[PDB]
Amino acid sequence: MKISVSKNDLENALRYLQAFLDKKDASSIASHIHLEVIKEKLFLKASDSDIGLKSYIFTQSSDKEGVGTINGKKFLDIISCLKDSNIILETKDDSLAIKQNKSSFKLPMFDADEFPEFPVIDPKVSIEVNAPFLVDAFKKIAPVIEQTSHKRELAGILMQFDQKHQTLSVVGTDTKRLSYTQLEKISIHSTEEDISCILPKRALLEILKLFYENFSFKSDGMLAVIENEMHTFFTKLIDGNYPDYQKILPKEYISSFTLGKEEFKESIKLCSSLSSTIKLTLEKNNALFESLDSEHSETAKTSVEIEKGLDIEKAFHLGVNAKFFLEALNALGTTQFVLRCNEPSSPFLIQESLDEKQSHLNAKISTLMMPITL
Amino acid sequence: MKISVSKNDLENALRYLQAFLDKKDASSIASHIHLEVIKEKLFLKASDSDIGLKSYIFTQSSDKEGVGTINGKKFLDIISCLKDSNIILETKDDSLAIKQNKSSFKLPMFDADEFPEFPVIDPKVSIEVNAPFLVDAFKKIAPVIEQTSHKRELAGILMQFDQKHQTLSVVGTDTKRLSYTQLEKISIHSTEEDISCILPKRALLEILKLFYENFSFKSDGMLAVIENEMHTFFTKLIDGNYPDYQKILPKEYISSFTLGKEEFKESIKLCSSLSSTIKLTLEKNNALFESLDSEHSETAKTSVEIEKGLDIEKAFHLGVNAKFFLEALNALGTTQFVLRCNEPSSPFLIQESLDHLNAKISTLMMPITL
Ligand SMILES: O=C(O)c1cc(-c2ccc(F)cc2F)ccc1O
Ligand SMILES: O=C(O)c1cc(-c2ccc(F)cc2F)ccc1O
C-alpha cells in the first residue's frame, strides 16, 4: 500500500469512524480501522455484527494498492497534529508509515482478514431521501426513546412504510409520551405493501451525525443500510412488533387550545426549578403554572395572558411532567401550539399550529402524553 | 427584609457565589447564601470557615433592612429563568419570597445566626495591586500546583514578601517542575522585613475568576483577604514552611539555547500523540523531536530548522516530559525561549528571551533519563 491524501479529507473521515471503535484495548483489532486502496480511493471501515461504517476519500496520488489496518484513535490524534497539506501513507510489512514534510510516524498493522465482512443485503424496501424531513423527524423524536425500555421494540425508532399510500410514518415512545409523524408522498419501492423497520437508539444517534439529505435507506427486514456519496452505514434492526400507535391515539378531542410556545416554555422552565411536575390551569384569558411535586415549603408560580380567548366555560386543570412537556414543545417548528384534551386524567396531545397543512422540507411531530393526577 | 433589585445585577452576583457553596446537601446551611439589606445595598455572602465571598448590589427605591438565607443553587436557577426587569425579594417569617410581576416564589430560609461570621483581620502584610502582574503570575503558575498534593504546603501557591527590597516572589511546584517569578518594585507594607503566605489551589482558582487589577491583598499570617470595589474574598492559608526554592535553582548552566516557542510547542504536541515523554536532539542548525516512552513499534518524529546556529560541537540529547515542557512554554510571553542545561540527567530551566504589566515566569524541570 502507498498513497497520498488530503489531510482535511482524512481527518474528517477519521472523526466519524471513532464511534464504531472499541478504543480502550489498543491491542485488540476492535480498536483498529480496516484500510483498503482500490483504484483512486482509500476506503476506511470500522464495524462489527450489529453496527458499522464504511467511508472513502479520493487519493491525490496512488502508487500501491492493497489492504491494511491501523489503531483508529492514534491515527486521528496524529493527523489532527499535522498541517493542511497532503499526507503520504505507506506500508512497510505490517506497519503503516505516515509522512508529512519533516514529520514521520510508524504505527503497527494487524491481520486484515481478522476484520469482519461488511454486510450486503437484498432489499425488501428502499427509498431515496432528497430532503431533510426524515433526519428532522429522527432528531425531534429521539429524546423520547429509552434504550433501556422494557418492551424490546420501544428501545428503537419505528419506520413504518405504506407503499400503497406512499407514507413513511416515524414513531417513538417510552410509554409516557409517544411522538409521531406521517411523511407524505414518499417514493417507496417495496415488495410488500406494509413493512416495518425498528432502528436501535444507538444507531439512530449515529445516523444524526452522518446524514442529512441525499442518501438512500434500504432494508431486508433484518439490517438497515444507509448510503450517501461518502458513507455506507448499517445497523441491525430490533426484531418484533412495534405496537399500533394509531389505536393508542384518542379518536376525538373535547377541547383544542391554541397557545404560545415560547411563553409556555419559559413558564414551565421557570416552575421546574423546584419540581419535575407542574399544575397547569387554563382559564379564558390566562394560563397559570405552579410547581406541584416540590418539597413542602417550596412554591413557584407564574401566569401568562392569553389575548385570543380560549373556549373555557370554567377552568381546565392539568398535571404535566415538566421535562416531557418541554421536549414536546421543543419538537415543534411553529410559534404557537395546539393542546388537545379530553379529561384531566386521560392522554393529551401537543402539536403544531396548522398541522394539517402540507410541508416539504421539515417533519411535523405530534406528541401524545399521559398527564399527572391532580 | 425587603428590596427591589436589578435582575442582571442579581444574576451576575449569584453566579460568582456558586463556587463558594456546598450544593450537594441542600439541608445544610453550607448550601445557602446569606442575604442582608442595609441602606441602599443588598449584601450576599457564601462561605464556610475555610473560604468565602461577600458581594453586593444596589437598589434605587425604598427598602426594609434585615437578614435571611436561601439555597444558592435554587436561587440562581430561579433568577436565570426570569425576565430582564426588577425583582422584589422579601422575608416572610422563615421563608424568602421572590416576586417579578406575575411570577412569585417562596423558599425556606435557615437561621441566619448559624451563618459563619465573615472574618476581619489585623493585617501583618498589605499590598495595593493596580496592574495585572499578580493574577498573570497566578494564572501562569497554577497548572504546576496539584491540589491533591500529599505534601500539604505544596498544595498551594507561595507568596514571599520582601518588605526591605519591595519584591514579591510567587512560586509553585509539584517536585518535578518548579515555576517562579520575582515581581519588582511593589509597594509592600508589612510589620516584618520578610513574610510568606501560601494560598490553597482552590482559592487561587477562585481569585482568577474574581480579580484582575485594582484590588488590595491583606493577611495576618492565617487568612488572606482580597478586596476590590465589588467583592471581599477570603481564604485560609496553608500552615507550614514552603521549601527554600532558591537553594534548588542551579547557579550556573553549561549551555544556553535561544529557540522558537511555537515551533517547539507544535513539535512536542505532535510527538506527544504517541507518548508522554520526548527525546529532544539539539544540533547546530536543527532540533529533532522523537517519541520516547511510546509503545513497541509506535514512533512519532519531526524536526525544525534553526537558522541562527546553536553553540554546540556534538549534538545535545535531552529527555523531557512533553506536558510539563508545553506548560512551561505556555507560561512565556515571548516568541522565543531560552533553554538552559547542564548534563542530560540534571535539572534544566526554561525562561523568556531577554529576562510593568506582565510577570515573567521561569520554570525549572527534572529531565527524563535517555
Ligand atoms: O404499553 C403501553 O403501556 C404503551 C403506552 C403508550 C402511551 C399511552 C398513552 C400516552 F398518553 C402516551 C403513551 F406513550 C404508548 C405505547 C405503549 O406501548
Ligand atoms: O520535594 C522535593 O524534592 C522538591 C523538588 C523540587 C524540584 C527540584 C528540581 C526540579 F528540576 C524541579 C523541581 F520541582 C522542587 C520542590 C521540592 O519540594
Swiss-Prot record, chain A:
Keyword Nucleotidyltransferase: yes
Record bears the keyword DNA-binding: yes
Gene3D superfamilies for the chain: DNA Polymerase III, subunit A, domain 2 (3.10.150.10)
Top-level taxon: Bacteria
GO MF terms held by the record: 3'-5' exonuclease activity; DNA binding; DNA-directed DNA polymerase activity; identical protein binding
A biological process term (GO) from this entry: DNA strand elongation involved in DNA replication
Pfam families: DNA_pol3_beta, DNA_pol3_beta_2, DNA_pol3_beta_3
Family: Belongs to the beta sliding clamp family.
UniProt-listed NCBIfam families: dnan
Subunit composition and interactions: Forms a ring-shaped head-to-tail homodimer around DNA which binds and tethers DNA polymerases and other proteins to the DNA. The DNA replisome complex has a single clamp-loading complex (3 tau and 1 each of delta, delta', psi and chi subunits) which binds 3 Pol III cores (1 core on the leading strand and 2 on the lagging strand) each with a beta sliding clamp dimer. Additional proteins in the replisome are other copies of gamma, psi and chi, Ssb, DNA helicase and RNA primase.
Record's protein name: Beta sliding clamp
